[PDB]
Design a protein around this ligand. Structure first.
Ligand SMILES: Nc1ncnc2c1ncn2[C@@H]1O[C@H](COP(=O)(O)CP(=O)(O)OP(=O)(O)O)[C@@H](O)[C@H]1O
Ligand SMILES: Nc1nc2[nH]c(SCC(=O)c3ccc(Br)cc3)nc2c(=O)[nH]1
Ligand SMILES: [Ca+2]
Ligand SMILES: [Ca+2]
Ligand SMILES: [Ca+2]
Ligand SMILES: [Ca+2]
Ligand SMILES: [Cl-]
Ligand code: NA
Ligand code: NA
Ligand code: NA
Length: 160
């Protein structure tokens, strides 16, 4: 059985365009998986701490037969192989961030994975690229992406 995973991409260090292109190549090389769709790249102001560069944000649809945690292993590996370093400050800048937003209709609460991503419904930098690639999306709780984006106040997201 194949499931579409929706993965958010963020980068604000060490040439984000290069980082995101390298990540797309690496995502392609994940086994049991195929990239179905790539969003536009967006240049977004930082949420959380603001004393950092703007982000390049994007979303990808990845159809896979991997187990969710097995997909997470690959995304974490790719981040680490692209130089991601853990420092003290909460929500610091990073070379690459790969968040599993959704894994089909699944609701996952394990030590390493919480899906849907806990805060995606409150982040334009996640929802707008997701709507670009999956305008018909429905969340596990039945909420429609189109309805969220019609109703909630979010700034326009600007393309890179
Ligand atoms: N849906 C998900 N996608 C990716 N990692 C997830 C996840 N659910 C839980 N995690 C866990 O998240 C842990 C911490 O990841 P971090 O990348 O440091 C959070 P962040 O992306 O900087 O901020 P955010 O979670 O507010 O977006 C990972 O080690 C991983 O086990
Ligand atoms: N634009 C942009 N800003 C970012 N800030 C972070 S840190 C976690 C985070 O999303 C965050 C979001 C909302 C609140 Br409230 C606090 C933290 N990552 C990104 C990113 O990918 N893009
Ligand atoms: Ca593949
Ligand atoms: Ca700071
Ligand atoms: Ca994140
Ligand atoms: Ca993350
Ligand atoms: Cl980093
Ligand atoms: Na399926
Ligand atoms: Na499998
Ligand atoms: Na809900």
């Amino acid at each position: 059985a194949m499931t579409v995973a929706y993965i958010a991409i963020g980068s604000n260090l060490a040439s984000p365009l290069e980082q995101v292109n390298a990540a797309l190549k690496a995502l392609g090389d994940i086994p049991e998986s195929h990239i179905l769709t790539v969003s536009s790249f967006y240049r977004t102001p930082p949420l959380g701490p603001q004393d950092q560069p703007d982000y390049l944000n994007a979303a990808v649809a990845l159809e896979t037969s991997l187990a969710p945690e097995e997909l997470l292993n690959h995304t974490q590996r790719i981040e680490l192989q692209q130089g991601r370093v853990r420092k003290a400050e909460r929500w610091g800048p990073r070379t690459l961030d790969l968040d599993i937003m959704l894994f089909g209709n699944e609701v996952i609460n394990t030590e390493r994975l919480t899906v849907p991503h806990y805060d995606m419904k409150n982040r334009g930098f996640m929802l707008w690229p997701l709507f670009e690639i999956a305008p018909e999306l429905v969340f596990p709780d039945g909420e429609m992406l189109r309805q969220i984006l019609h109703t909630r106040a979010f700034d326009k997201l600007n393309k890179w």
